[PDB]
């Protein structure tokens, strides 16, 4: 009963398309979106347009084709001055904008607590800062819809995610203002995952700022993404996740490029490049890890990873 349809590009809109495809293949998200369509009112907003689009995909007569998200793109440009243009944009900025926009619509409707957007994507970190002078530990919980992880050459996302939560020692210019010591002190700072989300969206920080050159470059490093991940909670002790989609940035630099998405569907992989959909072998996904050598060249690099919890 599945339907594989590309999306028309309406003027540098691949950044939107690629995210829409990833989200379509996040099952709990697609299901909540379709349930929204099933009950929805006549008032148009970004969520009703997204729901109409998902419904259109889900109900095509044929199993393969192309859909124009014309109404969704018009509405996107109307609502968000940031995207009200025909320029190339960042997929992650678009992802977070879209999710929070939907969430705000859902919250407003509850008021005539958590929305289903948060049920799906929200986790919680516990930041602990420990003054090394008095040993006082201060804990602060902070939610997220995705984690932006830093990268390095020839590593795995498992390592990137672990480094995110590793203990950092703060010295010299980064000393911590301790309220017991009433002064800046050396400290240890650690961000642990208190609660893992149903879908874990990981954003790779594939960029580096060169102070002297006054610009930044894209990091086209090899960063391996496994098909499954076991993740742990601080206080279920752990959760297994499976990779369901990768938004991929194609380009040698950060100012221009194109976006495509690879998704898992019924045990095989599909590549969605705007209007084109192709089957790809499990092995060809390795191309999206990034470049081994000649790393300032054109790369097709994984940028946003979507991991779906098994339960």
Partner 1 sequence: MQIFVKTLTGKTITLEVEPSDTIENVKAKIQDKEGIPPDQQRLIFAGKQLEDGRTLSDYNIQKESTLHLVLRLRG
45 binds partner 1 (CB under 8 A): no
For partner 1, the binding residues in 246-285 under the rule CB under 8 A are 249-251, 254-259
Q: What is the rounded CA–CA span in Å between residue 69 and residue 52?
A: 9
Which H helix or E strand runs over 70?
A: helix 70-79
234 close to 126: Cβ distance less than 8 angstroms:
yes
47 binds partner 1 (CB under 8 A): no
The option from partner 1, Zn ion, none interacting with 181 (CB < 5 to 8 A, set by class) reads Zn ion
The option from partner 1, Zn ion, none interacting with 93 (CB < 5 to 8 A, set by class) reads partner 1
The option from Zn ion, partner 1, none interacting with 258 (CB < 5 to 8 A, set by class) reads partner 1
Find out whether 160 is annotated in a ligand binding site: no
In whole angstroms, how close is the CB of 131 to Zn ion at the nearest point? 3
Q: Is 258 a catalytic residue?
A: yes
CA atoms within 13 A on the CB side of 111: 8
For partner 1, the binding residues in 124-163 under the rule CB under 8 A are 125, 127, 129, 138, 140, 142-146, 148-150, 163
β partners of residue 124: 143, 195
CA atoms within 13 A on the CB side of 86: 3
The option from Zn ion, partner 1, none interacting with 180 (CB < 5 to 8 A, set by class) reads Zn ion
Cβ nearer to partner 1, comparing 52 with 101: 101
Residue of 37, 206, 222, 239 that binds partner 1 (CB under 8 A): 206
Cβ nearer to partner 1, comparing 32 with 122: 122
Q: What is the rounded CA–CA span in Å between residue 245 and residue 160?
A: 18
From the candidates 118, 203, 249, 258, which is the catalytic residue? 258
Interface mask toward partner 1 for 13-42; x: CB under 8 A: -xx--x------------------------
Q: What is the rounded CA–CA span in Å between residue 146 and residue 37?
A: 25
User: Which candidate, 304, 259, 248, 263, places its Cα nearest to that of 4?
Assistant: 263
The option from partner 1, Zn ion, none interacting with 189 (CB < 5 to 8 A, set by class) reads partner 1
Residue 90 main-chain phi, psi, to 5 deg:
-85, 130
How many C-beta neighbours within 10 Å does residue 238 have?
A: 9
Q: Which residues bind Zn ion (CB under 5 A)?
A: 131, 133-134, 178, 180-181, 185
Cβ nearer to partner 1, comparing 70 with 162: 162
Residue of 174, 183, 236, 292 that binds partner 1 (CB under 8 A): 174
Residue 185 main-chain phi, psi, to 5 deg:
-135, 160
Find out whether 134 is annotated in a ligand binding site: yes
Q: Is 160 a catalytic residue?
A: no
Cα–Cα distances (Å) from 69 to 49, 57, 142, 197, 224, in that order, read: 9, 10, 35, 29, 32
User: Which candidate, 260, 235, 236, 232, places its Cα nearest to that of 248?
Assistant: 260
The two tokens of residue 130 are 């420990």
Range 46-76 burial, b when 16+ CB lie within 10 A, else e: bbbbbbbbbebbbeeeeeeeebebeebbebb
Residues that bind partner 1 (CB under 8 A): 12, 14-15, 18, 87-93, 96-97, 99-100, 121-122, 125, 127, 129, 138, 140, 142-146, 148-150, 163-164, 168, 170, 173-177, 189, 191, 203, 205-209, 211, 214, 216, 218, 249-251, 254-259, 303
Q: Which residues are annotated as a binding site?
A: 131, 134, 178, 181
Which residues make up each annotated binding site for Zn(2+)? 131, 134, 178, 181
| Residues designated as active site | 14, 258
């Amino acid at each position: 009963n599945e339907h594989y349809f590309g999306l028309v590009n309406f003027g540098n809109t691949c950044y939107v398309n690629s995210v829409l495809q990833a989200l379509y293949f996040c099952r709990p998200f697609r299901e909540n979106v379709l349930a929204y369509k099933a009950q929805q009112k006549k008032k148009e907003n970004l969520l009703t347009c997204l729901a109409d689009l998902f419904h259109s995909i889900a109900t095509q007569k044929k199993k393969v084709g192309v859909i124009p998200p014309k109404k969704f793109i018009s509405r996107l440009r109307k609502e968000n001055d940031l995207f009200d243009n025909y320029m190339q944009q960042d997929a992650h900025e678009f992802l977070n904008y879209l999710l929070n926009t939907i969430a705000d619509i859902l919250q407003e409707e509850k008021k005539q607590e958590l929305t289903w957007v948060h049920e799906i994507f929200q986790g919680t970190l516990t930041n602990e800062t420990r003054c090394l002078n008095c040993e006082t530990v201060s804990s602060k919980d902070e939610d997220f819809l995705d984690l932006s992880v830093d990268v390095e050459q020839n590593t795995s996302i498992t390592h990137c995610l672990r480094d995110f939560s590793n203990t950092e020692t703060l010295c010299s210019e980064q000393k911590y203002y301790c309220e017991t010591c009433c002064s800046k002190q050396e400290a240890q700072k650690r961000m642990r995952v208190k609660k893992l989300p149903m879908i874990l969206a990981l954003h790779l920080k594939r960029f580096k700022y060169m102070e002297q050159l006054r610009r930044y470059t894209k990091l086209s490093y090899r960063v391996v993404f496994p098909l499954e991940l076991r993740l742990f909670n601080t206080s279920n002790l752990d959760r297994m996740y499976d990779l369901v989609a990768v938004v991929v940035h194609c380009g040698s630099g950060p100012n221009r490029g194109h976006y495509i998405t690879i998704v898992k569907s019924h045990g095989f992989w599909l590549l969605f490049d705007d209007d084109i959909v192709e089957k790809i072998d499990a092995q060809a996904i390795e191309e999206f890890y990034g470049l081994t050598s000649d790393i300032s060249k054109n790369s097709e690099s994984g940028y946003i990873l979507f991991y779906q919890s098994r339960e």
